[PDB]
């Protein structure tokens, strides 16, 4: 299918991005192309953040540290595949995405499934659980059936 072929090409672009980055930094155009637009056969994990120094968002800073550990653990995993990717959207680069999602703070972790829209449990319950990488990994396994076993140096 034309669509199947274009999907395959899209996935190859994400795999090329993976050779240079563990986490894809997105603006609104990239978010829409790779996360909102069909076709997809992969899950996307997104950290919505605000890391600019002038904002001094302490929680975003700590959560990014744990997200980095998680995405590194994925990169080195025997589980690594083209069926799951990690992204981030910073408020100051993707303000339009935050507006579309009705978000006026950070951070938030979401899973965007390949088919359909996020379900209730596709927003990580940060305010209950905290954001240890191991807890993010447990949530990802619950939502995607991908098991990332976190490594720490």
């Amino acid at each position: 299918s034309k669509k199947e072929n274009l999907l395959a090409e899209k996935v190859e672009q994400l795999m090329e991005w993976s050779s240079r980055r563990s986490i894809f930094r997105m603006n609104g155009d990239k978010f829409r192309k790779f996360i909102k637009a069909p076709p997809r056969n992969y899950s996307m994990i997104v950290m919505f953040t605000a890391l600019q120094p002038q904002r001094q968002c302490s929680v975003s800073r700590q959560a990014n540290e744990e997200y980095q550990i998680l995405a590194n653990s994925w990169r080195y995993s025997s589980a690594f595949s083209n069926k799951l990717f990690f992204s981030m959207v910073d408020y100051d680069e993707g303000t339009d995405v935050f507006q579309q999602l009705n978000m006026n703070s950070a951070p938030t972790f979401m899973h965007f499934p390949p088919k359909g829209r996020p379900k209730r449990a596709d927003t990580f319950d940060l305010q209950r659980i905290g954001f240890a990488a191991e807890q993010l990994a447990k949530w990802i396994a619950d939502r995607t059936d991908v098991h990332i076993r976190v490594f720490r140096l």
């Binding site: 605000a50 968002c57 302490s58 929680v59 935050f98 006026n104 703070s105 950070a106």
Partner: peptide, 6 residues
Amino acid sequence: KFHCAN
């Protein structure tokens, strides 16, 4: 409006 702790 956007807000974050510290």
